[PDB]
UniProtKB/Swiss-Prot annotation, chain A:
Signal peptide: none annotated. Pfam families: Ribosomal_L27A. Binds to the 23S rRNA. Residues 30-39 have a biased composition (Basic residues). This is Large ribosomal subunit protein uL15. Residues 44-51 have a biased composition (Basic and acidic residues). Part of the 50S ribosomal subunit.
From Swiss-Prot, chain B:
InterPro entries: KOW, Rib_uL2_dom2, Ribosomal_uL24, Ribosomal_uL24_CS, Ribosomal_uL24_KOW, Translation_prot_SH3-like_sf. GO terms for biological process: translation. This is Large ribosomal subunit protein uL24. Keywords: Ribonucleoprotein, Ribosomal protein, RNA-binding, rRNA-binding. It comes from Thermus thermophilus (strain ATCC 27634 / DSM 579 / HB8). GO terms for molecular function: rRNA binding; structural constituent of ribosome. Belongs to the universal ribosomal protein uL24 family. GO terms for cellular component: ribonucleoprotein complex; ribosome. Part of the 50S ribosomal subunit. It comes from the Bacteria. PANTHER family: MITOCHONDRIAL RIBOSOMAL PROTEIN L24. NCBIfam families: rplX_bact. Pfam families: KOW, ribosomal_L24.
From Swiss-Prot, chain C:
The keyword Ribosomal protein applies. The gene is rpmI. The keyword Transcription regulation does not apply. GO terms for cellular component: cytosolic large ribosomal subunit. It comes from Thermus thermophilus (strain ATCC 27634 / DSM 579 / HB8). InterPro entries: Ribosomal_bL35, Ribosomal_bL35-like, Ribosomal_bL35_CS, Ribosomal_bL35_sf. NCBIfam families: rpmI_bact. Pfam families: Ribosomal_L35p (PF01632). It comes from the Bacteria. The lineage of its organism: Bacteria, Thermotogati, Deinococcota, Deinococci, Thermales. Belongs to the bacterial ribosomal protein bL35 family. GO terms for molecular function: structural constituent of ribosome. This is Large ribosomal subunit protein bL35. One of its GO terms (biological process) is translation. Gene3D superfamilies: 4.10.410.60. Coiled coil: none annotated.
UniProtKB/Swiss-Prot annotation, chain D:
This is Large ribosomal subunit protein uL4. The lineage of its organism: Bacteria, Thermotogati, Deinococcota, Deinococci, Thermales. The chain holds residues 109 to 207 of 210 of the full protein. One of the primary rRNA binding proteins, this protein initially binds near the 5'-end of the 23S rRNA. It is important during the early stages of 50S assembly. It makes multiple contacts with different domains of the 23S rRNA in the assembled 50S subunit and ribosome. GO terms for biological process: translation. One of its GO terms (cellular component) is ribosome.
RNA sequence: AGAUGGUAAGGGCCCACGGUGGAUGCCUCGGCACCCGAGCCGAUGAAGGACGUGGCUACCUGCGAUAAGCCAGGGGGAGCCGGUAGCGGGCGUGGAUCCCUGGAUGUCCGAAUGGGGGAACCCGGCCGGCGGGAACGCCGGUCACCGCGCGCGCGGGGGGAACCUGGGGAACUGAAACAUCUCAGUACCCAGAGGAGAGGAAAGAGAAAUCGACUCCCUGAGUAGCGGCGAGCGA
RNA sequence: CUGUUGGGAAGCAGCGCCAGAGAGGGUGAAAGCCCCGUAGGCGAAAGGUGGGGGGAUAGGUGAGGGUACCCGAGUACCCCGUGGUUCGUGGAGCCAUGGGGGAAUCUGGGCGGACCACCGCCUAAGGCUAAGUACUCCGGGUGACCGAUAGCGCACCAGUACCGUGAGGGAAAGGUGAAAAGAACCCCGGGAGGGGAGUGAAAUAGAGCCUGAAACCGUGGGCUUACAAGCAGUCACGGCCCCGCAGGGGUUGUGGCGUGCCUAUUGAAGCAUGAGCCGGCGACUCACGGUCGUGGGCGAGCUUAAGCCGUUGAGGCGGAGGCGUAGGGAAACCGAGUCCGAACAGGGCGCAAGCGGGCCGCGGCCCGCAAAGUCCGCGGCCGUGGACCCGAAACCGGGC
RNA sequence: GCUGGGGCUAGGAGUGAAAAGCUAACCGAGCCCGGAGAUAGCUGGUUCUCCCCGAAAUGACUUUAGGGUCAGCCUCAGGCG
RNA sequence: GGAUGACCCCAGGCGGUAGGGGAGCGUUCCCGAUGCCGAUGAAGGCCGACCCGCGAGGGCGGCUGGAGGUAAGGGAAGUGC
RNA sequence: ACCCGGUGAAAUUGAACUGGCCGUGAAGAUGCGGCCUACCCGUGGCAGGACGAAAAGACCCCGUGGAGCUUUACUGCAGCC
């Protein structure tokens, strides 16, 4: 395997579409922009703009709390993980040991959740849902609850 | 700050290349600004001169054209062989140029 | 430079779990006497925006 | 790639690991000698990988040799060259890179 | 009866060869970009100039009435008296040209500063010299203004591609109109700083029994919020 | 080094050699070994630097008890007017301060987003402080940078010529050859120019100089043309010239046919736009985000950023962080559910995982294959920037 | 009255026996440089070759009406059959 | 049919602006390159009635030109008037 | 003005091998159709035509273009109270 062999698979590299470069191309003259009018010009935001009529968005009404200065309130937050996700572990499970595993995102208080089979496991968590608690306290799990 | 020249007037040199490949002569003259040398009976050229006081009857005169100094190779007075120059710090202790097979001085 | 989320959207719309765009029914912010309780009751419900326009609003929210 | 680059080459008996480097103590002819004795005549081109400063210095100025400390190994310099030649001591760091 | 050919003033097409012109290729003393290094100069008169300066010298370079140069130290080792040949003359291994360092000289203008002035001109005071030298003129020194100190000292003044801080500070434009908003504390003007500048040892952060100067980068995060809750702005 | 072809060798051939140097460039062409170099190494009396080494000096250092002396004033603080911050008057604090009022010295004061109370934080109204940062006139190094319409405006005596009263505007213009060997002398000519001679490997390389395209102008040759009607061509046949020896090439007499190109348009040969002709320059890009698609990597996971180390076209480390793994709700919250509701109706928005094949006494659970996802490459499109290129009338700032 | 010389007044400003006259050969706001590649829903231009398909000039709304958003119609990929 | 782009047979489609898509050509530059072509002649230029390709183009030959050029396969754009 | 000697511009210019009528065609044809007419090339003259040249119509409308002006349009500011 030398240099002249190194080749990218079919369609791994593909030609650009070069417009405005002669009739046979496609693609020439107008350059796929049709005839006249802004959009053919060099240069309006079509996600929002709608022609001077009141937009689709701006006629919808606002909902709920927008928050005000000095902005967002620090309260604790809870990420759930599902009993099924607890599957790969043996012995004791903490939030710490959940993060460093990529199940529980950092700075999130841990809340065990229902979906899945309770494993007879010591699980240390900031919170348990109902059917999570029952399930565990029935497969012989040990639901330590910290603060 | 000086063009480096391996040759001088008028040590004797070989002509390693060109149309005088092999010819031998004493450097008449060195021209650093041109990096080239004048060597006797080497590079001779037919120069047209116009009728003037000195050269009445005008016609042509011969001259030694310069040779690019790279073309020339000093002969060392010991081997009698053309050689690359080397340098030796005497004791004196000035620097001299010395043969590259013999250690003969080139001055 | 990175897109900015349209706040005007963010503040009156939520993208669902399956990718639909949901908003409040219009039609009850005032002028509400003389409207049936049927009308009012229903206008209290979140609805799903026709697909053509759901897609646009979805591009205003690149970081949801 | 490092992995696959070396793999391919080995799959061609072009890979050759060495314990050490006979009498190479810096000098280029010194390396020649050794390479001859090892089946390395310069009919083939060599990526010579060693942390041995002295061996690299000897191999360096060869046209048919591309030299390299082992932390410098890389697929290109492998693919460029016909024959990969490494230290045990380089062979280790290589396997460590791919662990 | 009848029909058909040559003739070219000139023109047309083609072929050949030229003229014109300067494309194309090749070239590169030049430029661009990034990185690194380096980073102030100035009243001991800068930056930038004027005028001069060569045996013969239009320009350029170098130099300053000692004028392509003067004194010394260091480099260096055969050539040299710039780009320049030539006229016409010289120097160099008792080491020249050339390069580095220091020093000397450095007209007149220029912050310009003795005074004046239309920059490179003009005119003075005081002290010393020159000439026959009183009148005259030339040479040398010296003489602005402001801020500090106790008349005397010390500083300042101007310049610098960007970069920096501060004092001021738009509009086009965007909002598919526009006035709040935007462009933007941007452009620009001004003052100051310097090789950087600003900032800098908590009357801080803000929720952790926490952190521990300032700057700067990644992230936080287009999050929190801000907003004719528009365009958009944005910790 | 030698031969060899050549104007010239470094090409080709023979036999050698150096290499910590085979980066590059020169030499008459294509050179490791001829030249300048290159790897590796050495170097300053003088001046500058000196953030590294050392030396010195300034300066610096405790505990309890008591006293209540001091702890930065037109300040803090409050009100009025503003500015800064994400904060546009907003519930508007905090920081700065033009106006008015105007304290206290630790049982003092400011702050933690109006205010209050707790609980905490910090000590305003004096100042200095390296480094990490920015820039690039200047030096150097390197380019999937340009190569004289390019690249700076300037490769060249260019911020010049020239233009403008001025601020200011601002060009064009590079190449003989290896070497000037720059063409003595003769001949026509007042010169310019040219013919010989001469130099040169080459002189349509001769200085108005490498290559020397096209428009354009001539000369000579072939075919053709003075009863002919035209977007100039095409088809056919014929004649004449040419190359050759069932075929080609050139031309064109006659016959048929036939409304330029572009643009803009319902519609153009159009008497609608643009274009004298030729040459050169000229317009869908890039960055960061986004969304599909796609080639790969890995997959309940995937990926690093800035940095650090290494390299001097070698890569590695760095898990901070981001995206994914759960949703629903304005939110508290709850959670495979959740919101509305009195509901244990009803409804909105969500939730179900692959395909195997086998061992074993029905899946126990392996094992493979595939995939959620994500990371990079690629491409299409979108956002933000001048965003395909060229063009206003105008607005604003500072100068003249 | 005309005139030489020396002076002063300028850009929303000057000057004006008034014409919006003059302010360096075009003044309903000088020139130059800069913001600046202002903006231009307008006009023009958009450069190689072959192959497959192939529209629209409608409707709703629109300080819209020679412009746009969505719908209709074109095309490509995957899936359904 | 064969066994997956290898060709053969048979049938059908193949006007086309906006426009969508697909396959190519050529220009500069990088890897390939301490290589290969090159003075017994590079690039570039002028010819051609010859060869290959549907075509863009690519060869081959002659003249000029006198020092460069740059493959198979890939990569990147100041890419075709 | 014209002729001979000397010096010698210009806007314009798709390319031209550039006749009449009657038709026709984007509705006013040298260029289409049919007839008519007409050997080739100039020199001086005239202005009917080439919708002749020149000036991207000044009138007209269009642009959510611009500018000057006005007011008991809006909103501000200087100024005055």
């Amino acid at each position: 395997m030398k240099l002249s062999d190194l080749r990218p698979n079919p369609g791994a590299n593909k030609r650009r579409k070069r417009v405005g470069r002669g009739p046979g191309s496609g693609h020439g003259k107008t350059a796929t922009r049709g005839h006249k009018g802004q959009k053919s010009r060099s240069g309006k935001d079509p996600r929002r703009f709608e022609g001077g009529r009141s937009t689709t968005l701006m006629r919808l009404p606002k909902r709920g709390m927008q928050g005000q200065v000095p902005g967002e309130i620090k309260r604790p937050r809870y990420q759930g993980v599902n009993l099924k996700d607890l599957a790969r572990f043996e012995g004791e499970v903490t939030p710490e040991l959940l993060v460093r595993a990529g199940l529980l995102k950092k700075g999130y208080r841990l809340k065990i959740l229902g979906e899945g089979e309770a494993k007879p496991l010591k699980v240390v968590a900031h919170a348990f849902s109902k059917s999570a608690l029952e399930k565990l306290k029935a497969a012989g799990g040990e639901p330590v609850l910290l603060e | 700050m000086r063009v480096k020249m391996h040759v001088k007037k008028g040590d004797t040199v070989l002509v390693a290349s060109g149309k005088y490949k092999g010819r031998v002569g004493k450097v008449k003259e060195v021209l650093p600004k041109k990096y080239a040398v004048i060597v006797e009976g080497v590079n001779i050229v037919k120069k047209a001169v116009r009728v003037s006081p000195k050269y009445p009857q005008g016609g042509f005169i011969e001259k030694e054209a310069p040779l690019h100094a790279s073309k020339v190779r000093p002969i060392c007075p010991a081997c009698g062989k053309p050689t690359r120059v080397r340098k030796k710090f005497l004791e004196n202790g000035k620097k001299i140029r010395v043969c590259a097979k013999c250690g003969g001085a080139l001055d | 430079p990175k897109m900015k989320t349209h706040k005007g959207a963010k503040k009156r719309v939520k993208i669902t779990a399956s990718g639909k765009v949901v908003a409040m029914k219009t039609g009850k912010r005032h002028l509400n006497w003389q409207k049936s309780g049927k009308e009012i009751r229903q206008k209290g419900r979140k609805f799903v925006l026709a697909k053509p326009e759901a897609e646009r609003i979805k591009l205003l929210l690149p970081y949801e | 790639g490092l992995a696959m680059a070396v793999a391919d080459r080995a799959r061609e008996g072009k890979l050759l690991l060495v314990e050490a480097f006979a009498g190479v103590n810096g000098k280029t002819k010194e390396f020649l000698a050794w390479a001859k004795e090892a089946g390395l005549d310069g009919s083939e081109s060599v990526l010579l990988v060693t942390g041995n400063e002295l061996v690299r210095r000897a191999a360096r100025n060869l046209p048919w040799v591309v030299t390299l400390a082992p932390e410098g190994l890389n697929v290109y310099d492998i693919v460029r060259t016909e024959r990969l030649v490494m230290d045990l001591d380089a062979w280790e760091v290589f396997q460590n890179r791919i662990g």
